[PDB]
Amino acid sequence: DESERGMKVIESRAQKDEEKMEIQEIQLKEAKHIAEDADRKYEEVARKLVIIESD
Amino acid sequence: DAQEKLELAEKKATDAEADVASLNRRIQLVEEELDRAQERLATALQKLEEAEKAA
């Protein structure tokens, strides 16, 4: 019961951690894409700053 | 005296034999109960292996 409960607690934990893993991984890809977008919008506006600044 | 000793030796034989028979019964009962304890032990040990293996 303790090794099985353990296995089930761990399976539950493993699943919580697996979901958090996948959730954080999917959300990481999105956070990275937001960083790409955040850097992208930064570049669009910063580039405008440079263009406007160049002008 | 030899005759009384005989009745008493015959009685002792009767009792010794009654004890042979009563003990044979008891020895057999402990042998049967032993086989049962051993069978229950083999069972408990197999269950122990199953429980421990489950663990």
Dihedral through CA B22, CA B23, CA B29, CA B33, nearest 10?
150
Half-sphere exposure (Cβ direction) of A2: Cα atoms closer than 13 Å? 1
Q: How far apart are the C-alpha atoms of B22 and B36, rounded to whole Å?
A: 20
Q: Which residues of A touch B52 (CB under 8 A)?
A: none
Q: What angle do CA B36, B38, B43 make, to 5 degrees?
A: 95
Q: Quick one: how far is CA B12 from the chain centroid?
A: 22
Across the interface, whether the CB atoms of B54 and A2 are under 8 A apart is answered no
A18 class by beta-carbon count within 10 Å (0-12 exposed, 13-18 middle, 19+ buried): exposed
Q: Where are the alpha helices (DSSP H) in A1-55?
A: 2-54
Q: Does A2 touch chain B (CB under 8 A)?
A: yes
Q: Method used for this model?
A: cryo-EM
